[PDB]
């Protein structure tokens with residue numbers, strides 16, 4: 001069946017990598033943003049927020065939430081195309097696609113490709129691979145990876161095929177010898193850039209420039225509308241062209257090169273200028289690769305279209321002490337930098353930064369040691385863009401946000417530019433766990449890359465992620481049912497992993513001690529009275545008990561490393577564990593566990609949860625298409641589980657306030673019911689289900705972490721991997 005729900009994000013703002021920002025060259029305020037795991041977005045100037053465009057990508061085609069390239073038609077701003085697909089190795093089972101739209105991405109249609117697209121692979125900051133002919137807008141090019149070369153549509157992206165006369169598919173990969181089959185892919189044909197003066201409106205553009213990931217053959221050009229391609233004579237060698245921007249006002253192509261494909265590295269590179277009339281090449285690097293003070297390559301190349309003597313470029317990459325941006329107002333003859341050393345470790349800045357609207361961007365340390373500042377300018381800044389309709393507006397992506405200025409030309413007269421986050425409505429975190437206790441804040445998130453937050457108000461960005469300790473990624477989080485001010489979380493640190501505890505609901509946390517061998521946070525369970533923690537850290541060879549609230553640890557024999565630990569929500573003495581088709585139980589508050597079920601539950605299942613208010617009531621969700629699948633329930637403290645016949649597949653389960661006059665909590669699952677994939681709620685102990693999402697609101701590979709709300713009927717906290725933390729309410 002099907003009920004009318006309202007779906008919103010819990011307000012965080014950004015939180016991920018934005019490898020591409022794209023301004024429409026014709027229409028002011030038409031801006032798009034592509035992400036590597038969280039789909040695409042379009043700016044809404046009237047709300048000052050981004051609108052997501054790919055939430056209809058669902059469970060079977062989840063990889064289409066990786067957005068490798070995006071082009072917005074200068075000759076028809078209603079048209080927009082996206083190249084999608086997430087991995088070019090086996091992590092993504094499906095090929096990519098070119099999506100096409102005629103209403104700015106409210107609706108789309110897909111043309112699948114015969115190969116994979118690497119929206120979350122190395123090389124993804126390089127772009128744009130998609131390019132529409134600015135004079136004959138039926139023609140679209142796409143530079144492909146994996147050795148597939150350059151691809152072209154002549155009918156608005158309906159059919160695609162290989163341009164066979166473009167023979168150089170590229171040979172660079174970050175590391176040909178990677179055992180893990182991830183760094184070793186051909187990054188391929190990396191951008192396409194047209195010369196608008198080479199045709200007239202309605203007629204094929206004759207001059208086309210192509211960037212290839214081949215250090216000895218980086219740049220190609222056609223001069224007959226893509227019938228034949230030549231290596232561009234006189235060109236430099238040794239490097240990778242991240243970005244190629246043509247200026248037809250002066251007849252010049254600017255390229256930025258790095259020694260790696262990005263986005264996380266780059267130690268060397270150059271910026272060059274190719275003059276079309278004469279065929280002459282000039283090195284215009286702020287700092288050339290011939291200097292050995294240079295410790296980055298170059299990306300974030302952007303030209304001021306209202307004044308194309310103005311242009312910028314940025315470091316790819318400078319981690320330390322921060323990124324560097326550069327500006328020339330004279331076609332690269334000379335440059336100025338956005339900061340400068342005075343006397344080490346002090347620096348002068350041509351910018352100020354205001355993060356009042358996203359205060360957690362200081363990472364819970366306002367005053368790190370010089371030369372570092374907080375918040376930082378940025379990192380992984382592959383996209384930097386001057387607004388083609390306004391020379392005072394720039395925007396760039398980082399690993400965690402988008403920053404924007406409205407007074408860019410303040411730089412030119414000696415002043416300081418003002419930079420502020422511009423990510424409202426763009427919600428890109430991977431949610432790793434979540435809980436909704438029955439008093440205090442409504443929900444606490446445990447996120448990848450930026451920690452996690454107590455969320456006092458769902459409409460308000462929180463002040464800071466968790467601190468003392470401050471995980472880069474909080475992997476697991478629990479509260480004591482009977483005493484929910486008592487909580488624990490675990491997660492990752494530079495030094496491996498860690499644990500944090502509290503007895504005033506996060507008011508102050510302190511870090512406990514580790515057991516031996518911890519490489520990552522893994523998962524954790526808190527007894528119902530707060531009187532024992534059981535913790536399956538990652539890397540560590542055992543699961544461990546603390547009776548001293550994080551001060552000391554004892555191995556538990558019987559349990560494999562990395563088993564899923566959950567506690568009974570009523571009985572402090574009962575803990576439960578799941579690993580590879582065996583369920584285990586303790587009745588002595590953690591000290592020891594025994595296997596109770598070794599058959600009839602599927603080997604791939606790894607989500608189960610005990611029900612608040614009900615001793616020994618456990619639901620369990622998991623499996624695979626190639627084995628068995630569904631939802632199971634024990635009411636006997638894990639001695640036996642029954643399969644629910646109402647469900648064909650489930651991947652996670654949780655509970656929240658019962659319907660009015662029902663005797664049991666509502667149960668929410670991620671799953672398949674009566675041949676329909678989605679999110680489902682049962683208000684009758686699982687006898688029937690109602691779908692609470694719909695086909696426009698699927699969120700790809702979602703559901704790793706979900707939680708009901710014990711105070712609020714019909715509410716699900718729904719976790720995603722790329723689209724932040726959602727809440728759904730019934731209408």
Ligand SMILES: [Br-]
Nearest residue numbers: 317318319320
């Ligand atoms: Br660095």
Ligand SMILES: [K+]
Nearest residue numbers: 266267295317
């Ligand atoms: K570097």
